[PDB]
């Protein structure tokens with residue numbers, strides 16, 4: 436139930452989760468969710484240190500009986516083992532070793548090239564159509580999924596390997612439309628695309644949210660179009676976040692060769708101000724899209740696009756909306772939200788407005804308040820430096836949330 440911190444290993448440059456959509460009658464009537472797993476590794480690795488984790492929506496994890504996939508270049512599948520939490524229950528995350536030689540998926544020496552784990556099967560105890568019809572309204576809450584590399588030595592997520600998103604259903608009618616009428620302009624250029632959403636306290640004056648969409652290249656694509664054939668970048672932000680957003684910007688996201696993507700925020704990389712409507716959708720174009728997207732022309736580098744959400748209030752005001760306080764103004768741990776997920780999506784359209792093949796990348800941002808002290812887990816780990824599973828880190832009777840916003844005293848000192 437508790438979230439994980441982040442660590443830094445640039446060698447795990449990309450890790451994309453590519454699942455099938457769930458709208459066609461063939462997929463809707465099957466008990467198996469198919470997927471491929473793409474990875475790019477910039478340096479050699481070995482041993483049992485690093486793992487591959489796959490966190491699934493609890494609606495689906497309730498029905499999962501087996502998860503498996505073929506390692507890169509193999510015919511024999513490997514089974515994902517379900518994870519057990521601290522006390523012994525089963526999480527909604529399955530885990531497999533990374534290095535192929537240690538019952539994993541990818542070879543420790545296959546670097547500087549895209550490698551795929553194919554024939555991935557999420558075997559369920561029921562057909563997906565039955566679960567979709569017994570899951571509720573999937574127009575706001577989606578069937579979230581997440582994949583990342585885990586450093587088992589420090590129990591942290593490798594920052595550059597995180598990728599999230601959600602499975603497409605018929606409730607996502609707009610997105611499902613574009614993956615059925617794909618454009619013909621460059622159906623060969625790109626392999627797959629996934630997104631990732633994180634919280635960043637250095638953005639603006641109240642913190643920010645970073646949406647980093649990567650698009651893997653099949654070859655060495657180069658973007659050169661006439662002014663009348665210029666593409667457009669289309670984005671959709673979760674409507675549940677608009678009250679808290681001061682503004683949205685488009686940043687450059689350069690794949691810096693062997694170093695991959697720089698995950699840090701840099702306000703100097705802003706290239707445009709994005710406009711959005713009431714439902715959270717928007718689009719942007721130019722007479723030369725090379726101004727707004729670092730396509731890494733003529734190079735086999737992954738294409739990246741960064742969207743920044745500058746908040747107008749502190750991020751802790753999201754789960755603490757319609758919460759209750761006492762006479763002294765302190766938060767009662769039993770009134771604030773504990774979990775809430777937000778969904779985003781980004782994709783490229785051609786001149787007529789059709790999707791470029793495998794350019795749709797969805798992302799989910801999982802905000803969590805495990806100890807329910809009013810401070811998000813990401814806030815405590817990245818800014819306040821307090822224990823994410825303790826209402827009172829220093830042990831002086833003053834809760835962590837009350838100590839930071841109310842008492843204005845350090846939540847780390849008790850004497």
Ligand SMILES: [Ca+2]
Nearest residue numbers: 689690691731
């Ligand atoms: Ca570059």
Ligand SMILES: [Ca+2]
Nearest residue numbers: 804808810811
């Ligand atoms: Ca907390």
Ligand SMILES: [Ca+2]
Nearest residue numbers: 822823825835
């Ligand atoms: Ca805490």
Ligand SMILES: [Ca+2]
Nearest residue numbers: 827829831833
């Ligand atoms: Ca305290």
Ligand SMILES: [Ca+2]
Nearest residue numbers: 845846847848
């Ligand atoms: Ca204190």
